[PDB]
């Protein structure tokens, strides 16, 4: 019932990095404190790491396991935003605003960095985990790359949105924008895939499902509050990314079909600145009483 | 969460594995001794709360002046002796937020209920102080409600418009056209639900001037007028909403159609605009011998024939539209569309479904012009003219554009105080003073109609409660017999009042003299036909009051014939939606969708049972989706025999049912005599 | 292929290195051998013509009946006798493509260029046979063109009104609102371009009778005529072309400017409705200063003061607005506004930017009111006056609503011919005539205006052909000296003619004696400057006519103030967009954007060198977008110095520059006494 | 020293099909005899066939293979077009051109064409047998793609172009074109990682894959042999075509790295015609001259 529809949102929406001149950041990425400086590069290397896995593993295994010409089509556009497009775009980010060492250095921190570690082999044990021929892992794997789609990112992508609803880091700013857009696409579509998966199940199975989404939520979502404190204690603003998380947590549960888990929440102003019945022919003798 | 918030959802926490439908009454009791009398202002007396609603703008100081305050005193007095008490929480939550007076920061409440029934009565009764405390004892006891508008804004100085429904003709002709979008602007501005018949506007691919295929039919003008009416939201506190209605043989019907698919273009999708079809006896016709039909263009049959093609009878001119050449027809299959219509009800629940010849055949008022389109409720239909929006620097010809005042019985409530006369009377009279008094300036064939028809609509509200309080099933032939009698006294007793009203004034509706009033055929089936109640039942509960018969109705006929009629229309169900929570009864005569109802209030969510459900009477509050429509189509006919104009009748769907099922209940309600239809809601 | 598109397209071929552009001559011949005389109705004598043109309706009997058969036929004689030949295959073309009249079934043609230019004679004489033989001499010599409207549609009994540029004031009112979406409508439907000012409108989140936070701004205005615009769309022939204005201290105007953005919602983006903004020199001085700016709320600035923030003077009123508690306003950066206009037109070439003060400091008429926005092409600069439309069977307070009369002399052609003066008194006297003999009854301030203020705008075209021709660069200070020289020579024979009319009519415009013409003020700069060439090279040029000095400027406003003058306005520089190719030139005053340029009609390519062109003239030729934006700047200014309203001016920019350089030829178009800018076209 | 600058032409060629009005064809397509229609829709759906398997399994597979996120990201790219792009396109040709049923029997009837069958079986099976880590396995499939890329389609492409070069189907004929133009660079492309798995090979090693890749040249030249004549003799032009795939096979073993391998031959004349702005903020300068 979507997968054309979607196929249609996907391709209206291709970009390419080359479209967003980046020099001009240098004009306010000069005025930032160091404090600011650190959270932005941890934030960006670790959305750039957490892509990767999304674009050489999440969504190609979800391609190969998924049955449907049309929709294999639509999730290898999807693989391809992720590994030529939102790739080379978080590539051009950094290089324009670090020099080779300094971002050699970053990606070392955030590579051993405990918060980022967990939830990103998290997400990738999970790929790991598809059977051939079981729908049920396939389900758990899709859970878990909706989670990162609409939710993990998230803790991210505030800090660039924080600066995009300021006037600071437009260039970049806009960037991320577009990457958050296709991202929330993604998100919506593989959604719908395990909710297809979900609803063949028994009443029981489901149950079973909901329980493993919930609890799957609960690991990722304790982590994210350690790993939201860690970035941005030092620049004040973990009180506002936590209610951003769950927001963004709520969206994600609601891709999967399932009722949010945390009560409603406003977002930080700076930040939302920156964001058929059945067809019956008459039969005659209907007419008449 | 608020203590009568937690009383009230203790009502599902089932005792012993019953509802705790007590619970309910506990929680009005919090909700006025921590939130309604801590939150209300009070004064030394009531005049210093007078003075103070008077020069703070708050009430008109006109209606007021008519009476000396020892008169608006005693009436106020005669509000309060009643020691009226809310049942439910949820009615007294509903009138202390939609229609309780606040102060303008909206901080505190400056309206009870006694407050704002004594102001209205006030209103009403225009100077008279038994009057006013007749109105005050009717509504009080709730026997009788004025509509939404009328009930909220009566005497109110920041006051809308007391109508709560327009209908608009539009002619062909771009000046009429943007009359008409200024005409929807101005009176959703003033908060009234504006309904628009578009088939008269020539179909897209005819000519301007000899242009050819230059129109952009109905579809561009329904544009227009779902903008008009986006623009115009109430300032901005309710979305506007508009209704447009077209004739099933106009050649845009399809894409008229066509913009409530959900799979429309953003250029022909329209959001905002309700949309209705007035199907002729001729296109069941067609539809049942499966011969293809012709849908026409307008503007060629106006050419031809000098009248517009919804202006004259289908059933006797649809032959000559189709065998003549200078006529432009397109093929179409009847079955098909009403296939379509199902489709379009089921996904979306439109488009209104109007029966033009079930309308016209029991229409007392053919003379003035046959009821082309309803409202955007789908329940009036009365005559109109349309108007000649000449260009400026000209006279403009005005014709006559619907518009009546709504007014509901509460059954139960009437019923139990053997009130049914006066009720009706006293409710007519304070729907004739709210015509007399409605005076828009921005809508002239609005205003004449509302001038010369004298059109009145009083509905009636808790069918489904009396019926289900009562043991009698909704479904079942003794609660037909109760709504023939019921409604029969109803219409009885409100053409005595138009009558009296036309006697004591010495004027009648205008052109009343060529109506079925004046000759006497609209009496022909009341003195014919008895309509006391064939149930020992439903005879016992019509006890204490003088059911008329055909005697009683023959001297009406005769008083009638002498004195003549007030009101050209009287009678008109409304659905009644917000306001039947204050009354504590069934919205409308439709049957209750839900025996408790959950809805999401703020953060919290409340739930409202069925006033005067029990453990006795579970039953009998059947929920409609679980009704056979048929028998509802039934009802709804039976009440329909009574009243001059509409009822709006929602048809209550199951998912697993098809759209053969809707069309079977559509055309079981056309062969009933139904004249509307409202909404297809599925469960 | 057809031959004639063979023989255009092997202009590209290039033999020896160049450009076959004489072979477009014979594509000419080819169209005229091939397919007009073909196709072209041929009668036995032009009275048989006339009589089938008049009883087809294809002709107006009231024009032609002005004069006997003999005098109309010598006229076509005249006409004929100049043996006039199309020197492009293009503009051959465009004629029997546009403007030439052709069967009701579109496959023959009746009018040929001699016959289109007869009838519009006849119609500008008015019954004069020697007035007619004058503008048939006047036209056929190509001296003078009138517009589209005027030139498609004089004589025509189907046609459109001769007027397309309409601007309409909006008052702050859902009644003005209404009525002018309706005159819009009527406005397209009669084929013009309407550009209605919302500036007095209020902003969005404004009190509607005290209540707050209720209205939708401008932007839900914007939707409404956009939505009539797309309704209005010339009985399906073209795009409804609309335009809106807002100044800039409007508080909507960023959303105004969120209109025109990609990234805007359906509900936020109009798609059909051009957008500008008028700039006070005062925004300009707090850009410049770097001071944060404040746009107000213009309905509470009209309850302080009792009147619209568009109609006093902002560079004396901002203080006391800011200062102003009662007065509602929200910070914004002068300097970041600057750039989002610069971004958006980058992006879609809008908005239109108006310099408010620039225009205003030259207007003669400040006294009937200040021009506060300018038309759908930004080149309408005219005092204009609210109007109070009421609610119904109330009088409207009917103000005045621009509409000026277009017309292009063709300079080329007017200066080989060296009849300045004789082509700019025939051109205004048939722009006199179309002004008179326009009457729109559904526009009521409109035709109070045209009635009142009989204003025309005389424009002119192919300055760069007439230039490059003459070996001449656009950006040369030898073309500025010959524009300023060419156009004072213009604006004193268009002053001579007005007063000469004022003097044979007894009357002069409506409140002419407050203006600056009244005053002798108008005539200042010509009473001391002398406006003769500064280069020998244009001084020949203008040799074998009489070019007027500082006493013929003295005696000229000694004549003015003894007799007054006919028209408020008499001079507007219009783009000239279709006409340029029948007449063989280059569009309006501007420069060239492309020597050479393809088009594609049905599925052949057709390739239109500019007039002139050859390989000595190639240099002289130069693109638009290969030129210094800021000598455009120096040459547009140095004509506007003689005109008394706007000129359309768009900007021609490389992909290359940004959105600093865009700001900086703004502000050098400010400084230099630029009134309106049109289009950022980017190559 | 190659991938960059392939990943910068595969994403300058990106389109899609509804850049390409088709409504344009219907008249040329009415006017040609059933037998040429008939090969037409059945020759437009082998590609479709060979694009499908190419777009979900081949290119997937060898991206999964192929080390470097650079080479990975050309992969992935090549992937979607295959699927979202080139498969897509012959069916926006087909619901033009064709009424339902149509299309429908044609769809059948590649489900039953034994030459078809078999061609998709033995490329595809190649792409399955690529084991992790194992070359050798890589490289195989590796030659089955450059086969489909530059060899196998060409009995497809010949009737577009042979139309296209009389001046028939042209807006048809433009999109094949262009999916032409796409798979000779991911012909090329492919053979040059297949060359750098065979340069790391013994001498014996690389005797035995050049046997290989002959041997499957052969086997699936006598297939596409039955194919063409199947398909081209109801409308005279066998012959003809089976020139056209012998010169692509020889391209297709060039772009190996091997000489050609039939003789040189006169093709068709007629196949041979076939073939925002930059922001800057306002200096207090720019407002004085
Ligand atoms: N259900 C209700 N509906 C309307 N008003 C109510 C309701 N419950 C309480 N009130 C209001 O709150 C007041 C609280 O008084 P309550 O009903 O508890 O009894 P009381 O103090 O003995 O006096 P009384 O019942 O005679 O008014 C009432 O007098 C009335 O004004
Ligand atoms: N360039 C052109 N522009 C306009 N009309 C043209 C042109 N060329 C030819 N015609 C039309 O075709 C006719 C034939 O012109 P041609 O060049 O053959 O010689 P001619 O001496 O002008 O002919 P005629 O006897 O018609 O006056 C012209 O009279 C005119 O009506
Ligand atoms: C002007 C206009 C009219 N119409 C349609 C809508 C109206 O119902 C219909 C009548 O327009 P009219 O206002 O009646 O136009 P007219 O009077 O000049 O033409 P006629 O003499 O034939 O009546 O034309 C459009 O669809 N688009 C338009 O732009
Ligand atoms: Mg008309
Ligand atoms: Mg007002
Ligand atoms: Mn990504
Ligand atoms: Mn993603
Ligand atoms: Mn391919
Ligand atoms: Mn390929």
Redesign the interface.
Known sequence: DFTQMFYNQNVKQFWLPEEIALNGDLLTWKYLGKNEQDTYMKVLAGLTLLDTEQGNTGMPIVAEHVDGHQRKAVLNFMAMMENAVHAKSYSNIFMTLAPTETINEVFEWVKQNKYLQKKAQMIVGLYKAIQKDDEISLFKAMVASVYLESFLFYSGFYYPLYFYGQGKLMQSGEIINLILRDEAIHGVYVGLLAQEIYNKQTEEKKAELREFAIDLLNQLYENELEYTEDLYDQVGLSHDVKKFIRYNANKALMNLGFDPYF??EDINPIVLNGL?????????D???? | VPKWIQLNNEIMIQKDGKFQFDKDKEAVHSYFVDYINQNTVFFHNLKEKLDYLVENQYYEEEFLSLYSFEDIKEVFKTAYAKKFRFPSFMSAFKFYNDYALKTNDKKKILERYEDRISIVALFFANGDTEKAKEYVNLMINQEYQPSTPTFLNAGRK?RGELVSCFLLEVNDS??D???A??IS??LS?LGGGVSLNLSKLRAKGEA????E????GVV??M??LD??F????Q??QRQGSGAAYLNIFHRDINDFLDTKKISAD?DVRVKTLSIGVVIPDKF?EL??E?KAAYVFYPHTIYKEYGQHMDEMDMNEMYDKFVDNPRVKKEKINP?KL??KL??LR??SGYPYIMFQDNVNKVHANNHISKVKFSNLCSEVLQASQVSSYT????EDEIGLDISCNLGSLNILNVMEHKSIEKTVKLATDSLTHVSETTDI????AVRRANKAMKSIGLGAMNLHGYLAQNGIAYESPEARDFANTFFMMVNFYSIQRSAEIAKEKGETFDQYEGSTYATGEYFDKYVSTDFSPKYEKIANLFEGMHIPTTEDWKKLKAFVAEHGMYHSYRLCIAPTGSISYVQSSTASVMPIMERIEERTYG?SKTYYPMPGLASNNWFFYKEAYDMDMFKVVDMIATIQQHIDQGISFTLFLK?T????????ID??AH?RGIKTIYYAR?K
């Not at chain 1, 209907?286 to 009483?289: A, E, G, N, R, V």
């Not at chain 2, 260009?391 to 000209?394: L, V």
């Open positions: 009560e409603e058929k019945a059945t067809v019956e022919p008459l039969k005659d209907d007419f008449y009483f | 920041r771009l000046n056209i943007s009359r979008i200024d602007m101005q501005k301007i001037k000899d242009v295929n230059a129109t952009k561009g003008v544009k227009l903008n008009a986006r623009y115009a939201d300032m901005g953003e069941v539809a049942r499966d079955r009403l296939e199902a489709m089921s996904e260009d400026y620097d000209e300036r921005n809508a002239p953060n998912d049912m098809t759209t053969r099922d809707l069309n079977r055309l079981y062969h599925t």
